Symmetry: D3
Amino acid sequence: NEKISYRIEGPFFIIHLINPDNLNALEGEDYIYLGELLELADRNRDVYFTIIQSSGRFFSSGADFKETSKWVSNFVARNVYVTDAFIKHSKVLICCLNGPAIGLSAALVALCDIVYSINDKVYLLYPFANLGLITEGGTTVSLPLKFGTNTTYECLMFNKPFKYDIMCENGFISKNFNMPSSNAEAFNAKVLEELREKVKGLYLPSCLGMKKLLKSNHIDAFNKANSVEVNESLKYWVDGEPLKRFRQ
Amino acid sequence: NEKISYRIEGPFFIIHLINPDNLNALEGEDYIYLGELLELADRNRDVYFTIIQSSGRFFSSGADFKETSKWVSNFVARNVYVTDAFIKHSKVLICCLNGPAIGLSAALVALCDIVYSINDKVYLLYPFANLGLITEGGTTVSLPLKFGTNTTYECLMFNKPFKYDIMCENGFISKNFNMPSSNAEAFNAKVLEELREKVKGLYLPSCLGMKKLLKSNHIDAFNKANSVEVNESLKYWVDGEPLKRFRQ
Amino acid sequence: NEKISYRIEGPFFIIHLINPDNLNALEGEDYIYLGELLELADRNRDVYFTIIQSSGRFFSSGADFKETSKWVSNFVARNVYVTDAFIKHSKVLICCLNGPAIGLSAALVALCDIVYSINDKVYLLYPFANLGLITEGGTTVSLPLKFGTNTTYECLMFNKPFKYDIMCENGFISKNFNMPSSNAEAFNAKVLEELREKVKGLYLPSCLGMKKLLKSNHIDAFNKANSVEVNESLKYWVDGEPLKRFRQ
Amino acid sequence: NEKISYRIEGPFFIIHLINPDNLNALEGEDYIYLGELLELADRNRDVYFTIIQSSGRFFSSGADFKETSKWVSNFVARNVYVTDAFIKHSKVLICCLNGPAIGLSAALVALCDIVYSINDKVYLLYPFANLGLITEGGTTVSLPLKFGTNTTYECLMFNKPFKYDIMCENGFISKNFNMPSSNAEAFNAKVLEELREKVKGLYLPSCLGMKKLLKSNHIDAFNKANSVEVNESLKYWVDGEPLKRFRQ
Amino acid sequence: NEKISYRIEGPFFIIHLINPDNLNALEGEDYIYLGELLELADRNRDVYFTIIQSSGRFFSSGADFKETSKWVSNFVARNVYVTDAFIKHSKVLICCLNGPAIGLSAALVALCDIVYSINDKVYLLYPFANLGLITEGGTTVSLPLKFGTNTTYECLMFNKPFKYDIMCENGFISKNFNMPSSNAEAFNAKVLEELREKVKGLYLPSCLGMKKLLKSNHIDAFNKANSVEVNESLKYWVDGEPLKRFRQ
Amino acid sequence: NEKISYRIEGPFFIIHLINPDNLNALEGEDYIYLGELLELADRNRDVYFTIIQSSGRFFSSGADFKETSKWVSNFVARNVYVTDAFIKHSKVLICCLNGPAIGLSAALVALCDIVYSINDKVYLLYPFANLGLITEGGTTVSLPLKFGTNTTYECLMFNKPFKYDIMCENGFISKNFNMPSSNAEAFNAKVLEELREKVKGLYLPSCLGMKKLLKSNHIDAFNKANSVEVNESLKYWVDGEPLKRFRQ
């Protein structure tokens, strides 16, 4: 994979989206590859934190679109697989949001444990109602969990973004670094610099043990949502609305 | 019914409380009639949104009070029936709060998916402790859900209002229109004007499909709360405190 | 017990931590004694509210540390017993936070129904990662419940405090009294003065009936967390990290 | 109460239905009194077993029937109260079935932990379909639990008895004493004689501790069934079929 | 449809498999049609019982088998749809087993409320292990429910039939009519004759109300099993074993 | 380990208790070793079935008994560990019961998927009430599951065996081989001979996939029971009754 790299640095397994010209739009194979990277981090006994970083002005613009058209099975299969990988990951997942995230990639940002923002222009957009689709990526559970049920209905029902002010009002962002959007590279490195200082002295297996207990609060709900989001969308695909709108 | 009207406008089924002289206080039969209206909206395949609007300076002052006194069975039966109608409604429920809401009618505002406020003087009051009663209308679940558990205890235990500032601090209000309280009529129409613009372009069945999945997060808890609130209150009624206080 | 007193005043059972020179650090026996006091309040049919108050500049600095070293069984047994007492208490629990609370005593502050703060310097610290331990005191559930899941991960994973600003942003504090930290005594009395005015007129059994229904939302999760936090920590103790760090 | 006596004998609290001329038919007040007896046994720290015994040829023929007709509230309230008493009882409940049991009293036989039969003519009958009613006494859960789901549908749907052969095929009866039906008195005493021999040597608190864990398998289902059976029947009563049939 | 007829007779909606030459083997469209018939019975306010009857010596031999081979999606979609129809049916489902039932059709026999057998040669066979498949039709839940967990493992793991003796030992069969296998027609009519006599006198809405409460014991488990059986099989199909074995 | 051997034969991982002179009584270390063997079988991708076989006239007489007396922690820790290993095992567990099994080893027989008996003299005994203890090994759930709730109370409350006739009446035994008790060796080999014939032709991964779905019916209940049995017993140990009785 050329759009995504990774490396390990002490207890940190770092994943980097490096396709800024295309606003880190991702195809099915990029979402599989992201899931396999989380599997590799999850099985590395030296890794304690899995940091997701991107590049350019967008974190990611979401799915990249270019009866063989039954090609929606590999689409649906790639969404489930990468969602399930984020849900079950046992290492502390940290998103460095260097700009907006849209669709599935915004769904994965909502599954990370901790989120840092480059500046106040970040936003998350879930345009399901505009694509003739329904919740995906576990957002049925993660959005009301992290932004509250009334705010989630306003955004999802009317295809409106979860903006910075909403994200701060809910504690979704742990720290805003207030850096220009023209340098994700420097924001990425300053998050890693603060992280290296904050882990000093700590017993790192305690982070994983607390995460394991923390995750048991909503883990069944998340696995259930992953399966019913997919079950429920099938008729939307059979009707064909998404296909038309996806041709746009 | 003379206190409540309704009409349909494209995908919007609009319900209007139109008894401003009495601060849209409602009797048992008005709460049944409200439940039947939601049933009619729920079965209309053209309706996607059910908008609740009122009139005057109050959204509603709550229940209107004027062994045949075993008249508390029709009271308890009307609360359950209208709560159950809000809980199971499948269309997007939107409250236009044109002023304060008290009691059962404040419980129903907390069951809507989205809430807009006329101005910063709105408040929700649940004076159960002052009437010798306990939670009703599903507020056992909806209040800690939408306002947080510590804030819910402060308000409920001490008969204190959930005011505007608390509502905004929790994202309970999606938009404050900042209009005078002397014209609910203009606020009602401006909410409908914004709604007509926000649905343009959207695939409306996607709104209902996301709501169906969203509602499965807490639907069992809500149905359970509706039944145990009623079970639990019966001894309060047998003791007779509410009867005395309701005579006041 | 010399470090903790109690008294009853109308419907209020008042518990007072009175060891300000040692920052109300508590040993195992002080945590048992606190649990027994809650049992006494819980069985007193005249008590409706259980108020916890402290003294000095700290609410409490947490556990006081001075194969008989299998002394961690009485440690683990005292944490479970006092957590279980806070979880199942049927009277309205109110914490008067006169300064910071750390560890188990910060876990118990998060189990109270209502919390008042002396001033904006209060904070809650859970330094599990720094002691080679994991969540305790039901904080697996109470922290994400009251502060949100992303904020809880930032604080717990990196041994960072839940400060005043975070507490207000989540409605954790019902009222800040903005008094100097040199007089907890006057803050304690002004909370009791406001409480005596707010209960006037109310039907006090309604407070307990609403609390009983309110508590059934998360009571199983809390009991489960109390048991799995303890189950899960045992290997941390068998490995011996906490023992070393506790020697510091 | 003249129809029911009780006594304590070592670890055994013995309850005896002593109205053989009327086939131990019970009224609402007899079912309350039975519930209060179980409360007395449950709070006696010397009792470990609660033995229910009757007299004559029937264990019990069920409910004794002789807008004040809203007399069905005390009916429904007495069924719930005595069912809830059997469900939550913490001592080992043992039924000595000296003949057939019908209706609510057959529902209570199905809530005992252990059942002995006088001879092969015993049967349990639940004639809900013949009275225009639905399951009661927790039989929604206890019948499929103890007799299997297909057999429960045959009996309940067609108002057919659960006979001895069905009871033995499911292990419902621990021992048949094969005594004439003209002497319940001797069967009652021989059950007590065997019981006194079987408890010898045993650690009696172990019986209660195993029962507490055993009961947590279905206790929520039983409490839920008690509440929804009652909720669901209300419309049957509002329609008036049972009233007519109960006049027969 | 030529392989399946139906008719209504008082409160009985009768469905009849009438393809004895082919041992009432069914294709996908026959399983859809069976589901639609149950929908028609379920919405008929005069029907209280839905009786399933067949013809000839077999009740049914199961699925009839004669990248377009992605034809397994319509296969999987037809199994889910007809299972879901049996699970949610609100009328009393009664199977008249006139001979053996194999596969999906044996799964549907295990979802009926009541089962009558023509004679002791009936058996149910679930040859999942022999087709490279896993449980289907809700048999993950219905088999351990109705035959016990150890017996279910013996049969399923080793592709062995649930025979008559096993069915009687578990109360799966309510009545064996002991008629020759050369006349299903007479057995069908004698079941209907007994049914007409057993409903006399009964309040038929009481049958449906008891079924509604009875079904809430395992309805979530059944819906869950229907969805995870399908989710889990997909990799068996991707591997291709079933395809090979289905070519046999 | 000298008391237990194992070997692999095609898809069968065979475990053999080979201490007939001591009636295959087991110590803590033998129960750990049994758990580790199940781990080895569980991770072997060639094994599909885990067969447990013993020797002599008893399958096993249970635990072998010969403040350091706080030796009950290693006792309790060994019971949990080996129970958890049986609960989570993913391969088909088959017990060859060559005679009676008592205590923990009888608890493990009740956790196997399939059980074969040498002859009609086998029995299972759980003498918790006679040792001043409570349910262990997951028997809180497995006994009512496999023998029914009333029969379980008779046996457990009165320290009476689950005998062959009770085992057959519940389908607990899939096949009785009716061989003398003086040759377990020949019974062991004839079970393996039948097993080798029954797996022929089958798709072996289908056995594991059906087991995975089958086990999700009660797996949470089993894990919960393992943890609360242990939590609940601790006070029995603190009181000291078991210690006294274990000295006997």
